[PDB]
Amino acid sequence: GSSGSSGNSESKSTPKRLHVSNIPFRFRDPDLRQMFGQFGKILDVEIIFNERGSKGFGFVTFENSADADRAREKLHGTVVEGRKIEVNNATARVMTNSGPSSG
Template structure:
């Protein structure tokens, strides 16, 4: 499991990769920030992932969970590997 990577949910539609990176840069060096886009519409699906240089930064970033960004309370968790997320 990648302890450097967080899942960010309930993102406002206005957030893109750059603004997601800026939002979490206060917690440490961000090596990657990706907003997941719908393949057909190219619009945000309202969630993304941020990868930090260190697990400590990712842990600190969990403080953002519940904080309001552009009118929406975002959800922040340590990212789970794809196979762990499946519930069926």
Template structure:
């Protein structure tokens, strides 16, 4: 198996493979598409995703009173292959100049909401994008969601990577914590909600994050970005 250095980390060279979808809902496979530019319309989404295959439906979520876009949508395909391919090849690609974030729509999003198998990554170089972060961490397991926090097009220096299993997240943390990425030593820790973040958990790295302004900003960002009902 060939290997290469990517962002200062030795990783295997692999060809992207479509991720397996969850069970179909009413005969369609649904994707959540977030981080949309406010000007993105359902027609824009159709134009973007129909290149993958026939689309069953598209729903752009809007405010029920003002009618403004909530900047996320659902794209439904007729086949698991098309939905998997769209997730694999369109995730983090730009639409109206802004990278979109795609993941499987979860009918029962308990794992995402509780932060299980979720990693907090800080001290990121300003050039690191969500796509690059996902590329770095995808070698260690199936990723449910990956994002570098940003505001007004400028990164905040931290991000989140959530796996489908605790084992994958711990393997990634042990492998990447303290490695140099674009000249900066990244900090990778198990992420926990503030209410659950105690020294008693036995996580020395988590304890060392207490009082960190960046950690508090990360907590607020995670709550606003990942705890909504998709």
């Protein structure tokens, strides 16, 4: 960018998995596919939950990294059924591109 270099082995956007919490227990994969789907075509979805404790949070895997940022923020602060949900980037399934850019 500044120094003066080019030529990237991979020049394609990689799926961006987001993390959501504070969501109704009635919610399911289907919903996420629709709700979030509005932003774009979802790739994968997994909403972990259980009885032993309070496990109310799932994950959404988008097809594009850009579209994931636009939505993430959009949903980041939405009142669903009178319940504010939290949306933040996850660092579980991803391999930061070794380049001149850092987090």
